[PDB]
Assembly symmetry: C4
């Protein structure tokens, strides 16, 4: 039915601040992909993470169900591997069905 | 003779703390706008209906939406905004 | 002879407290720009005219616009920016 | 394989005045299989454009370019409004912070 967005989005910036070994502190605001799947089929999302000096890593899989939103924190990604902090990266977000992606 | 924008827009982030869609209708026909609000864990709600007259702008505060239901505060949502005629929608 | 951008841009927010369009013309012909200002409760006002020369930028402050009339402060508005030649516009 | 982005991006604003940083930065992603030979042109209100500033973003890599770090053909004057056009032989994705 309703089809809004597209199957591939790219975010050229990405950086998780080097906060030390506890939780990401209250002070610094993170980076979060906000995804809307306004369609009637579940979105199987695959994120690839790009770096300045090494091969990309992924896919990081996750599902955004039919007619739902999901916020994805880059800091929460861990399969296949966590993203190193204090490191510049970029991502490609791919989906089987159209989705809307925003980065705040 | 001015047709600018499109009939469907989606804003992937929304949150009202425990904000505003600005809409321009630069066209010669009134826009009958419908907003649907999406959530992480429940079915979407709407249509919230409003009119942006010909050759006018309107700022819509999500907090002011109440028919069919108010939007809960401290809740992440997203919206799809649909119109009969092309409109330009922006969010800060 | 680069052609980048487009001839019509719309900015749905505008508010001068009780601000800046940045324009690039990367082309080889001066851009004659016209701005129209839209309101929630009155007919639009314009064209406000200005020129962005070939291969130059220009920052336009909504506050500085005055012909045909200044834009009231503490008032929500929107603008349409139209050009004879493609330009890039950011707010 | 993956082709995402485009060969020409324009950024209409630019200005060079414990842990965060605010230099004007172009973040570029080349998600494609061929290195991007990028050319930056810097545009001014009152003088001719300057460039190309040349740099390479390798295949399947990202690069952060600080406007402050640009110097060939010339450094960009500080406390000066500018704009930039970023051109590439292959599609790239460009974002600025």
């Amino acid at each position: 039915s309703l089809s809004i967005g597209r199957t591939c989005w790219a975010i050229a910036e990405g950086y998780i601040p080097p906060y030390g070994n506890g939780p990401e502190p209250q002070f610094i605001s993170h980076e979060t992909v906000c995804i809307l799947n306004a369609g009637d089929e579940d979105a199987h999302v695959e994120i690839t993470i790009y770096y300045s000096d090494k091969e990309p890593v992924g896919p990081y899989r996750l599902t955004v169900p039919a007619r739902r939103t999901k916020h994805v924190r880059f800091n929460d990604l861990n399969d296949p591997a966590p993203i190193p902090h204090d490191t510049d990266f970029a991502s490609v977000i791919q989906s089987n069905v159209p989705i809307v992606v925003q980065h705040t």
